């Protein structure tokens, strides 16, 4: 453990953690440096295992997966107090938190080059995940758990393969939320996912069935048909571009109907905080580097997707059969559809253990609760959480550590 | 207006009402005696309109939706408490909630026989509904509307009917909230209903696709192949029978995962208030009788179901054209999903005015936020509430009475 990125006294906690924390720079490729956030597990650091949590974007900061999601302790709508998360992913796991790729939050580069690729990136967490192990050797043995979160659907396979080559790092499985796993299936999905939760009706239904779909195989991702391209394009006016919130479709979207912030979010409880200069000096945060944003409009503005699908890396993180993969959705989530990533991981066509179940959640009071459903496979099983969205441990924490705990566990649902 | 009808001290409440209100008998066919309470417009009786409230069931009461829907006050957790309703129909409206048919609630008849079925409690709501005339004389004139939910979907067009026949009615509308209006269309909307809610799977999906679909139609409602057959019916385990709260998808089911209450519904709040001695003599309810239940059981399983399809009582209500239709529905119920009614809606054919578009409410802070959709044809609009269940001013009361007002003042939503 590098002493210097411990973190100290934390502002806007009233009483002080009991378990360690760093912040600090961990070395990628060239001249990058990422800023990451590790937090010890609560229950015996020496013996839980090691997760990295990857939000997407691209562009977007694994700050919020910290401090809107699961972290041990969520900012308060003041922008100023920090309240203990009782859901806290860092529970049961020590969780390293990485700002990426660089040039988001608070990470940067020497040359300040910012447009960056798929297999980039990928080299570059690799590599971070090497630096981590540098800095922090006690943590070399323990169990290695790779999770993200939207586009990190890509980030964390892509990475998972790169790790897969390096016998050093002890991986044993990796869980993506509403992930991005393939363009062709959010896609195709998302545009059923429309008509069936409301929003198209049937003169469009028709439309869309009649130019984008012959004999009951539609192709809504990349026809060629300039009549489906102008209802394809309504259908992306209504979902993205009309007041819905997209990352969830039963709540309302942020700041009423009309930087990059995401869309329907507001971001200002998070900035308020950690661009507090006392909060930076807590977090061992060089002075000269700019704002925080929970996005980068650079880096998403000059990415460069590559990867179309991820169907290659799961089937060759799945050859070796080491590893225990976990999907789980939102199941009101339009950003990336819960039934496109049941279709992505039904076509990677692998022994079905358990048959499509409820599972369930035990509330105060409430009882017992069917939390989603979910489908097992031989180390791969897909996930729903009823009634949560793009970003599940916020709308659902009990459900989400539930999940969690039980695949951290090698755990039935 | 029956003054000894007047409730004059209603228990629970700290302050007394601005407006009258009435409780006590109808007469319907035979000897069967309807209870209701009339709640006067806050706003001037004598020039609000006249709506009556029918809750569906078979056999369950419309005083649900006074305490616990739309009433100007709501029963409280404690059954003991009443709370003002800012959200009221009353507010711009005379609503009249009426427990029918003969035995559900504080109705009865002299000969307790409660077997009945469509076309008798049509008459006899509608004889009712005379009887009231008689008692309020002073309200004959004022605008009259229909309006009801879920099995009223069935009560309502039927009533209609017969209140189109006799022109001392000033009939000018109807509006049906989560109604049944065709179990064929009711039951294979519900069956893609699952599957795109996340509720089924593929290999279920592709067995129901096999064995009870050809090519651009399924048949999910009485299809005769057996292998279709043993799907629907695993369908409607899932959907009906395993721990889903089928009013409302997204809510926790009221007292864990398994007299006839409604399913996953907590009746407590209400009983507990009507079965006050105190209440019942506030409302003038005969002592002999029997004590409150939000259903009857025996009404509901005595009951005979004739009309399989409410298309030509709509079309016979339309074909005059002095009437103005809505039907609403909350877009997470599963009990009377809001696709069945729209597939209902535009299979009526009538000439599309308004395309279909959003609508939207003012929210506190919020600003304006989508309330859900509406597709308009002459004198019939069919509208969702976007995250509501099958009781809509539950949910979402503040759309629900913005809905309403709009109805009411043939304003466009
Ligand atoms: C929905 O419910 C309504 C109301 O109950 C039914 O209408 C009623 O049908 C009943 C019998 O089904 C009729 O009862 C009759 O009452 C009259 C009184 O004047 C008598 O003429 C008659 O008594 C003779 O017949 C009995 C048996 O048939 C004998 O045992 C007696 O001794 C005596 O000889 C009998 O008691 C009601 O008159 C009738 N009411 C109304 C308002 O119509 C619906 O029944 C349908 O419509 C009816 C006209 C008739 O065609 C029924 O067969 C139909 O089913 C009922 N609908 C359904 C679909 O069940
Ligand atoms: C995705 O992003 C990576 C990293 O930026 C791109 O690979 C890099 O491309 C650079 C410029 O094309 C390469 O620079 C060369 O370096 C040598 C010195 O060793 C110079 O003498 C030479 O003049 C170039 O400047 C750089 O080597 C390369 N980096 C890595 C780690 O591979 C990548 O570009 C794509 O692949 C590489 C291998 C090249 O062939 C490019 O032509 C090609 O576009 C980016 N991917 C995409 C699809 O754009
Ligand atoms: C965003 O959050 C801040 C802090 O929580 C709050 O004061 C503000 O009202 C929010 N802004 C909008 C546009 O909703
Ligand atoms: C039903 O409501 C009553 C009072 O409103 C309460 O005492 C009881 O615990 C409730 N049951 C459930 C399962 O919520």
Redesign the interface.
């Known amino acids: 453990a590098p002493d210097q990125d411990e973190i100290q006294r934390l502002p806007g906690l009233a009483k002080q953690p009991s378990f360690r924390q760093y912040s600090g720079y961990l070395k990628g490729s060239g001249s990058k440096h990422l800023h990451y956030w590790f937090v010890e597990s609560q229950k015996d650091p020496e013996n839980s295992p090691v997760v990295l949590w990857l939000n997407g974007g691209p562009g977007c900061s694994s700050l919020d997966g910290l401090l809107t999601e699961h972290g041990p302790f969520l900012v308060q709508p003041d922008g100023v107090t920090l309240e203990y998360n009782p859901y806290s992913w860092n529970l049961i796991a020590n969780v390293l938190y990485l700002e990426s790729p660089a040039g988001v939050g608070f990470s940067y580069s020497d040359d300040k080059f910012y447009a960056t690729n798929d297999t980039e990136v990928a080299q570059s967490n690799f590599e971070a995940l090497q630096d981590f192990f540098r800095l922090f050797p006690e943590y070399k043995n323990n169990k290695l758990f790779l999770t993200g979160e939207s586009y990190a659907g890509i980030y964390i396979p892509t990475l998972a393969v790169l790790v897969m080559q390096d016998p050093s790092m002890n991986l044993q499985g990796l869980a993506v939320g509403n992930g991005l796993s393939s363009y062709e299936q959010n896609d195709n999905s998302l545009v059923?996912?429309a008509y069936?939760?409301?929003?198209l009706?049937?003169?469009?239904w028709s439309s869309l069935q009649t130019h984008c779909c012959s004999?009951?195989k539609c192709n809504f991702y990349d026809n060629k048909d300039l009549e489906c391209v102008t209802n394809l394009q309504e259908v992306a006016r209504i979902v993205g571009n009309?007041?819905?919130n997209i990352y969830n479709?039963?709540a309302?979207?942020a700041?009423?109907?009309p930087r990059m912030d995401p869309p329907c979010t507001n971001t200002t409880a998070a900035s308020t905080y950690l661009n507090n200069p006392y909060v930076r000096k807590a977090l061992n945060i060089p002075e000269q580097l700019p704002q925080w944003d929970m996005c980068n409009f650079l880096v998403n503005l000059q990415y460069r997707r590559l990867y179309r699908s991820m169907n290659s890396q799961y089937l060759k993180l799945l050859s070796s059969q080491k590893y225990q993969i976990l999907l789980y959705n939102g199941?009101?989530d339009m950003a990336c559809n819960?039934?496109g990533d049941?279709?992505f991981v039904?076509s990677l066509n692998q022994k079905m253990e358990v048959?499509?179940r409820?599972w369930?959640v035990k509330?105060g009071d409430?009882?017992?609760?069917?939390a989603?459903?979910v489908?097992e496979f031989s180390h791969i099983a897909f996930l729903?959480i009823?009634?949560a969205g793009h970003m599940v441990p916020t709308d659902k924490p009990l459900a989400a550590f539930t999940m969690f705990s039980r695949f951290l566990n090698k755990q039935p649902y």
């Not at 069936?196 to 929003?199: C, M, P, S, T, W």
């Not at 009706?201 to 469009?204: A, E, K, Q, T």
């Open positions: 059923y996912f069936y939760h409301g929003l009706g049937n003169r469009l004999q009951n009309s007041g819905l479709l039963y309302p979207c700041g009423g109907v199941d009101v819960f039934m049941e279709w039904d048959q499509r409820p369930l509330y409430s009882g017992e609760q069917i989603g459903f489908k729903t009823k009634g």
